[PDB]
Amino acid sequence: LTDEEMDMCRKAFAMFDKDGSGTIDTKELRTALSALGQNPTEEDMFVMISQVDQDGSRCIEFKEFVRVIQINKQMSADTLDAFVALGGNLDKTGRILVDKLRSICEEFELTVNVDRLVKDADRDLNGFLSYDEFRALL
């Protein structure tokens, strides 16, 4: 759907079908799994390919490659990372504990820090940050 995903898809398809056959055969796939540490049976890999092989080829190709990347990616951009930053640990409640931020500044051992930021990002002027004013912080 995008244009750099085609770039990474071509690079990974190059990585898998490493000999140059133009088709993912089972041996190169097991080579990739064994480089990742896994050595499963020779009957489960058959079922895995048979679900991914649509053409009846017993070998999957670039159209099928991007079909599986498409379904797994877009079925499940900046909402998630800024969201789950701290407020996404609270899940639509708008009240962040100060003790979480004290713990974060505790573990990473930072030399000098004063928490006046949370004092001066206070937009409800209560002592916590809702999510819209949390993005206003970011």
Place this chain on the structure above:
Amino acid sequence: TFDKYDFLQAAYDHFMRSLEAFEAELKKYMAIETEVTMINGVNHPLKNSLKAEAVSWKTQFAQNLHKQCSDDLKLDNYIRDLEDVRNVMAVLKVREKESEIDNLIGPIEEMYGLTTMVSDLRYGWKKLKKVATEVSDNLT
């Protein structure tokens, strides 16, 4: 989606909820087996352990039928061996229907659910003919 399978005598409780519905029970366990195989096509240590757990569960459920199969066998062995009223009372027994219920319970479990008592089951079947011969000699 692995957690939806978190599962041994609860099976006996399921049996306490109760003929071919038994076969339906074994087939819904078979359907759990086939969707596990589809997930094998999707996904293995965490998978092989529950695979072996299915190996545990259906074999033990087959054996908790097989024990009742043995009980059916022995209680049938029992009956294998003013008198005219007793002769008529045994002459009324539908008895072949009870032998057939036991035969259907056993052989379906052996074949479609896949001891030396198979020939004993055959001699169960022929037992009624032998008993009729004995009753014929008991006519006088």
